[PDB]
Design a protein around this ligand. Structure first.
Ligand SMILES: CN(C)c1ncc(Cl)c(Nc2ccc3c(c2)CC(=O)N3)n1
Ligand SMILES: CN(C)c1ncc(Cl)c(Nc2ccc3c(c2)CC(=O)N3)n1
Ligand SMILES: [Cl-]
Ligand SMILES: [Cl-]
Lengths: 4, 123, 123, 4
């Protein structure tokens, strides 16, 4: 999971 | 927004859609290319091709279970492109590049047409 | 194999499937969550959820146009997860994380359950 | 396009  | 994103989600979705295709699960159309028949999901075809997008948004054609392609379309070129739609992988070879580019132009798959033009220009 | 790969293909496919959902094109099921109704594509639901995968591979349920979820399922939690299925983006907030995790456990969306558990452990 |  990432900060888009 | 303040959303988080799962990097591999789109790839995992496409992998599962290909698994459904391979098991012939919820396929709702057969694409006829000369004597050859290819089962697929209308939504995936639309998501990948400008031609299928136009066909399946048409109020009459959206209900067809069989679509016949132009007799000039090569079944192998179509097979390679159908595999690309479901995997992101294109089996581009010296012996098939002309048939693949012609099929991609007909199917309106702009990114495939672009890489075929570049590979032809290099040789 | 000797294939080439288009990096953005899976993301572009998912973006187009979401565009079809937003225009209600080729949606073939309505998911009922309490009073709320959500239209979707069976194949996308199956590709994202272990629960829908089991439902739509069942020889009888595969033909249903309406699926009713357990009354304990929160419509907002479902809406956030349905958006995630079609975008890879999860709107996870302090006020919804418990409903999102409970819905993801019921839908069998392992990666969402994992990030909810980690975000809860941090607080 | 890349070599996967
Ligand atoms: C253009 N548009 C709003 C849209 N919405 C939904 C879908 Cl499924 C769609 N697909 C599509 C249309 C044109 C093209 C492609 C997909 C690939 C391409 O090279 N051209 N295009
Ligand atoms: C497991 N399998 C062969 C498969 N083939 C096709 C599809 Cl659409 C599918 N989807 C599915 C099954 C289980 C789970 C998911 C999708 C997401 C998850 O967390 N669990 N799973
Ligand atoms: Cl393309
Ligand atoms: Cl997940």
């Amino acid at each position: 999971w990432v900060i888009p | 927004d303040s959303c988080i994103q799962f990097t591999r989600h789109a790839s995992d979705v496409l992998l599962n859609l290909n698994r459904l295709r391979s098991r012939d699960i919820l396929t709702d159309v057969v694409i006829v290319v000369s004597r050859e028949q290819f089962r697929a999901h209308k939504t995936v075809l639309m998501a990948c091709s400008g031609l299928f997008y136009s066909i399946f948004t048409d109020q009459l054609k959206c209900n067809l279970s069989v679509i016949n392609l132009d007799p000039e379309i090569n079944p192998e070129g179509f097979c390679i492109l159908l595999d690309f739609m479901y995997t992101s992988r294109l089996n581009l070879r010296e012996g098939n590049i002309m048939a693949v580019m012609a099929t991609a132009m007909y199917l309106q798959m702009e990114h495939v047409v672009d890489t075929c033009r570049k590979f032809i220009k290099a040789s």
